[PDB]
């Protein structure tokens, strides 16, 4: 019942930070077809827009 505030603090330190965004945005872009053909699973799929969850 207190963990959501911890995730909120994490987001406040990271989510909108411009240094973090410049370190992460458009890095390691993978297409859905390549993600599927390369054997990826989990977020590596779902980050590319594939709707899959076991």
């Amino acid at each position: 019942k207190n963990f959501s505030f911890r995730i909120d603090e994490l987001e406040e330190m990271l989510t909108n930070n411009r240094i973090w965004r410049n370190r992460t945005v458009d890095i390691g872009v993978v297409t859905a077809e390549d993600a599927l053909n390369y054997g990826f699973s989990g977020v590596m799929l779902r980050g590319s827009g594939i709707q899959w969850d076991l």
């Binding site: 019942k1 959501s4 505030f5 909120d8 987001e11 989510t15």
Partner: protein
């Protein structure tokens, strides 16, 4: 005699658990922030104007004293 006793939730269950993202907006328009910046710049410019004019007058006074002492 004795009944079953194991770890269970309390009757009626537990209270609600927050999970939604909560990143509230502190709030100040870009116009207001820019206006505060420009206003403090203008105040500093005015103060430096008056002080530097006074400093010019003081320097002229010191130069006059030197000129009087030169001969």
């Amino acid at each position: 005699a004795s009944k079953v006793k194991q770890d269970m939730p309390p009757p009626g269950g537990y209270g609600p658990i927050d999970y939604k993202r909560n990143l509230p907006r502190r709030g100040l328009s870009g116009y207001s922030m820019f206006a505060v910046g420009i206003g403090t710049l203008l105040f500093g410019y005015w103060s430096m104007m008056k002080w530097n004019r006074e400093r010019r007058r003081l320097q002229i006074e010191d130069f006059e004293a030197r000129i009087a002492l030169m001969p």
